[PDB]
């Protein structure tokens, strides 16, 4: 009877820092997923402040099968483009901003592609 | 901003009746709303979460149902302790938004005559340059009543301050009313009368400064 | 089991900053959202904002331009700041928690007590207490001529609970508030038990005891 998957992430966020801080931007993702074999992907994109948007990081759980038991069981690769710093963190669901300059301020989006479908995405405006 | 419409906005049901209220959303909120109960003066208590799940320590007569954009809260058998107001709140999208709220008033109480009492002003207040007397009718259900003030023969129109509480655990009201005036006008007259008219034969009490 | 307490001033002059602080106890700031909710004196309640454990504040955009929420994990508390308060911001302010770990669970499960913030232009005024001596017996206390409304009346340090009515405050045209608390006691229980009413006015920081006896 069940078919598909559902996610929930509280789209709109607002984080304010100051130069030289060590904050960590974290999302609290909620999910209920069936049909175990999927391709989860958690992608952090960035836009300075607006139409264009850069790419900052992306974690991929490729061909995982842990459906309802905590998906951190199976681990995936977390290759991040080094044009930024931004030490990535657990499950790929949170960034860590180490020794931040002002230039990192901007609108960050965290889009979750589940099996090629954008199942949720949340905005967070980081500014001084 | 999701608009949350609640229905109805005010209802009156007797004890043991089946109460049903509806919550409607402008967008599909997948099994995402909570029903809260706010008793008069107190903070809301979580009645239902996940739109169908009962919070720990809540009587089973509260039942939540619905999904999509249509939701229903049902009180199976009303009790005189469930006079509170009821709200439905979504959590799907920021900003989180509540409903209009439903005032559930209990109608089961039969017409009960009030208990009338009167308090003349105290000497401390008289030394404090003011003179206030207090008329009090306690534990009567039906609606509001009329209370008049007589200055030994004459209905007084000014200086009356009337207040009413909410329904108690026995579903009864108690209208309180102050008559305030200067000590000179308090001492110029002899017998002060409070006259309450409700469900019987018009009652009245009187004081004379002894 | 956790409990929360608001610590804000009950009177703020118009256009100024309203600053509240909610202290949590009996639990952690661990992984929940910590939120603020207003409720006008007669209207319904509206959510103003919540904050996570690493900044990441969610604000209601109706007044995002004026509000900020700060965290004090070190002292286990969190504060609300609302700038340029108008007359419409007079409301009861609750601090609460939004949590739950499941799909459909994001409820405001544990609420605070709620503090009343009236905005106007005055300074303060303490209450005046006067006794009211006598089927059964009825005795009362009369609170008169005080400013912002939040006031509490108990009897015998809260020992006398059943049979007590505390009336809503009324606005006397001198721009002040009046209230009364009545108790129905047995007729034979008059001369035995010493009846004392305790009145606490938080904005003026005034607690007063009053004995009642014929």
Author numbering:
A (entry chain C): 305 to 353, 388 to 466
B (entry chain L): 1 to 210
C (entry chain H): 1 to 82, 82A, 82B, 82C, 83 to 131, 139 to 218
The authors write:
Results: The 3D structures resolve distinct central and C-terminal antigenic domains, presenting an array of diverse conformational epitopes.
It is possible that residual contaminating proteases that were not removed during purification cleaved gE during crystallization. Serendipitously, the cleavage event permitted growth of higher quality crystals that allowed for a more thorough analysis of the gE–Fab interface, as the side chain densities were much clearer. Fab 5A2 recognizes a large, conformational epitope, burying ~1000 Å2 on the surface of gE, mainly localized across beta sheets β1′–β4′. All three heavy-chain (HC) complementarity-determining regions (CDRs) are involved in binding, as are light-chain (LC) CDRs L1 and L3. The epitope includes a cluster of histidine residues made up of His312, His317, His319, and His332, which interact with several arginine and tyrosine side chains across each of the 5A2 HC CDRs.
